[model samples]
Target: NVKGNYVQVYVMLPLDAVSVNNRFEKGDELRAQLRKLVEAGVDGVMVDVWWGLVEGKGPKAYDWSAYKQLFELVQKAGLKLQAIMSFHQCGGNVGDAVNIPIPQWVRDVGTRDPDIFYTDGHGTRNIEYLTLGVDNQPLFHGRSAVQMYADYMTSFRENMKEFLDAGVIVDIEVGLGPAGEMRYPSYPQSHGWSFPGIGEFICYDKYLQADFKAAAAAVGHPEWEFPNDVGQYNDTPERTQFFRDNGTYLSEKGRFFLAWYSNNLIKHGDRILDEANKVFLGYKVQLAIKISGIHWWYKVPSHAAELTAGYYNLHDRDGYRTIARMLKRHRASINFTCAEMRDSEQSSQAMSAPEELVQQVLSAGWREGLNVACENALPRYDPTAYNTILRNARPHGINQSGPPEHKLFGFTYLRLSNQLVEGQNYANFKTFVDRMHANLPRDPYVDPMAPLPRSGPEISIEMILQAAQPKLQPFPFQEHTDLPVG
Candidate 1:
């Protein structure tokens, strides 16, 4: 997660590791693309090791050819790799134009049980991630969900042993929930969720329902039940009895469900990271995790979107502290998104504050002594986005006291698409990377150069549905000389 003294930058590859035909980039085009990142001074590239494609056929069956070639190629370009163990599916999330579903074997079983995936209040299933309800069930090939993850990771650790030993793979970003982040599938596009929508609580699946009921009875409240007043997927907090002002969320039962729901999310990550660390124990790589930036409806007291997403973060309570401490225990870096959002550019009606969310999360993780990394929520070639990123990235003040302990661990560009390598976009992006690197060490005792966020009442909103991001371009990056001899 850390590289040298300055902030390291990584460009994420496309969702599909190998193309539909299971082929990869070869010949000049490989270098043509890889060279752009190298020339741009990027430290590495992050790629999702899709569980969908790798184990698509059956249990313990993994196809690593495409991912293998892709990894070796990046290593050949002398770029490091941050491989994401994407236990979740690819489509229906932000920047997802392609659909990569989880293993059909798993889905085939789900067809029989119908409770393997996250189910919303309306009975529509969210396949973006598997429901935490079945976390310990032996429904799939006599293995629990975490065992499946560990097996996949073990498969990865063995197949990529060469890279691991060679130090080409520097980080393993374990996928905890949807979009490979740590949270419930609270906001899923495939299930009809929209921008700024308060996604429904996904505890309807049979297993989660059973777990819920069991937990309630244990707490001397067998009378307690799931939240029916929480409202639908698209309803606002004010529209719901649970999330509205003086709502049920403030009640004893509300707090009880909130703690249970969010704690379950945290427990899943903790378990996965436990196995993740075990598989890569002897290796010299750092483990990392991503937390979604639910920026919309944040200024609201209820934080309904976040609450449904399994954050449990409210105005009075600090939600990130627990997750930060969890990562700290696992020795994993905490990575977050939406560094490019500014409060000034959003609409006031939505009451969003992306900057404040970024600061609070980064600060929380950094305070717990965890390496904190961040990424842009959307594609932006603007300098202002870069400046905003640089600002929050070094929130502890660049070189505040000593060796920049709490400074941002790194920043991953939204992606490395053809548009990203285009003339204008690439130029701006290259400058952003240079500037991120340019945040050099000032006099240790001289104090940091960045400023804190202004405590003001002017609120604004941002694009919370990262899944619905339009699309991007690809190809070519040979424009740094007088002429091309090739």
Candidate 2:
């Protein structure tokens, strides 16, 4: 009879139904999804408002019909909504459906000036998300992407005024990059890397390169240059030797490069959120940003050797601090995914160790005085694991020996829409919700201002020096340094 505190839960829904040039013809399907979520006792529904779907025809000439139907159904089902402003497309993801490019008009212009999209080392264009140029200035039809995002936000606000006024739309999920997580595209295998899955492709277009050169020069390293030969070798002893020796954050140059890369991500993230916040000023809703937990470059050997090009590493504490600080300043919230509490080896798709990933990001957010939430990509529907994850996320009291002292503000069950419609899974879903409700404590006299233990692991010079080691080395006086040390 453990009485736990109440935790808010939401259900995630995909907007894949309304792709570019495709309409969600299944009205009953949409209604059923909303009804199932509400009936399951969820507080709200999280849905993506796809940029390609709405503005596919052209800019400023919006198509709210598809989203309108979704909103109407959500309202009818007596559920609130959290709209994900999906700036990116749906296709190309591992398990996702077919390709849905950005608005045809935007793509048309981007095709003319390929720089509008993210260009890899080999000059292949990633049309998923736009690249923030040398000045961190991304363009959409000759105008800044930030400005364009602001316009989209304005349109959303204007069109959904009724939902806002009625308190149905309670949150806005701002997307900064691919898969709505903050990072540059580093799809090595997709773009024809020799090692198949052994490299990270960094954004090396004219703008980013120029910015890097200027930053390096300003920092008294005028001779610095981006490594052009990255991801060019096979996964043999020779290739591993090269990366272990030079391609890591353990070197001075590598540290500087990582610092520069992290700064760019933080800056661009701030700009996007700032613009969105401006549009939604004075609104009584949480402005949330989703970030990946696969940071902490030192933990993953391959990722470290790959220069951590695609992921935001936790070792860059200042980077996480910067994002958390910005979210706090804007009165926004933070959310993370792939929190299934499983080993990366066990889970083929996991980006990092689940526990470490959650702790690092959650600690950062809590330390910065921002509310934190978490969701899982692969919901196992196992009660024990679910309970463990939620318990671990609970706000720790002073002197506690587990997670940091941060309240778990929300938990979005990755997808009720997917599981709710199925046969036995639907019943299992109900059982899961019931168990969660029963186990969660409901204390009326909980103290909101109680002094709690500070968040995060203590920083030590030894740890820093250890992380600074250029390559993996043996213990004591051993000689070999590049033979799968981890």
Candidate 3:
């Protein structure tokens, strides 16, 4: 039976613990505090279960000595665990955690390739998108990553046997790198690298001659001029040489070629997730989409305009729509979804209104018919001023302030998920909408950076169906077809 509408309030770590004790060494104290929060009616708490933390320094070495009671406390309190099984830490406690790098055994077994890192204009590097570099090649695949990752899950399952047996739902957050790196200034610019990554990079090594091969294979006619020198690909010999040696090229003219390459990378991620699914005793896969191209800090210094281009592209481009459709089609197969939480105060790429992006993403996901959740709500600037509005808006939840200008800058995914899971039919959607409106944050300070849509335009059932199309509609009607025709 459906219960009355309620909002799930997820809390972060203890301020003293997250801020001071980088390793969360105070196990007993943290556990005690969590019990109190759970008693206070909080829904769940977030925790970091970094893979590198357990196996980064070497293979099969685990480090849950400090986390036992913490996990137990959450379980005992009946609180949900939103575990971030990170690939690598952006900058904080990088070396301390053992699992930052890919397992050496996996690298040895998997094929080899090159990885590359992009740099921001300020000379700071974007390590989150760390490309595997092998003999100067750019491979982003995590080869044999599945085998080692599965092994880690087996080990984790053994160590956390009690938790696993308890029916505790563990939500996995995967593929987070270089993200939130630029947010904090104290940390130097660096990313996590691994051997399998190196191998994969080599595989993606610039397809100079291969481009022609692919073109020939794709179309009968092959009159496109092949590059005489790698200069046409990129200026730097060091940058372009590996592609030449490996037979790949980096050029705008090679857009189709790059698209093929991007597709390969996406496949690698899917393969890794599949491998993990087999190993982890019980957990759901949460897809991570780091919209770096949409953020200035993660933007390529030379391609600043790409952010605007990318946003429009996401809305209009065939490739963007294809990826969105692909994700939508596979939504049921995926358990959780996460993306960059726009912090207007910190990010230049912050949309005029934070919730606008949330809606955009939610609409995309809704079109796909998947549910997702989000995090990061702090820096409580004016709790009292916005408290009323927030109370009226999010009456049943916490009132954590987000970025400045923006009243709250966290992702609006939970709402989207509720709508999808409970609102599969039109009647359910109406009920969900009413519940959402009743529980909606009445915070007067809900100052979103994006343009507010005009009144009287309701989101119809047909619109929802269009958003969730499994494949892109073809031909001249392609782009505009997705838009509401009415």
Against the true structure, what is every candidate's RMSD? Answer: 10.2, 8.3, 13.9
lDDT of 1 by residue, 226-307 (tens): 8889877778889999999889999999988988888788777777887887788767677889999998889988889899
lDDT tens readout by residue for model 2, 404-426: 33546777776655655567666
The local lDDT score (0 to 100) that residue 110 gets in candidate 3 is: 29
**lDDT per residue as tens, model 3, 345-450:** 4444312223333334433433444443433232222222123223222322322342111111122222211122222232332332233323343222221122
The Cα error of candidate 2 at residue 182, in Å, is 1.3
lDDT of 3: 0.35
| Candidate 2 error regions (>4 Å) | 1-4, 134-139, 188-199, 232-248, 295-298, 301-319, 344-352, 395-405, 417-419, 435-486
Pick out the ten consecutive residues of candidate 1 with the lowest summed lDDT. 477-486
**Candidate 1 all-Cα RMSD:** 10.2
Question: For model 3, how many clashes?
Answer: 51
RMSD of 3: 13.9
Cα deviation in Å at residue 136, candidate 1? 1.2
Backbone-clash count (model 2): 10
Worst 10 residues of 2 by lDDT: 477-486
Query: Pairing residues by index, what is the TM-score of model 3?
Result: 0.53
Q: What lDDT, from 0 to 1, does candidate 1 have?
A: 0.76
lDDT of 2 at 288: 87
Tell me how far the alpha carbon of residue 368 in candidate 2 is from the true structure, in angstroms, after superposition. Answer: 0.6
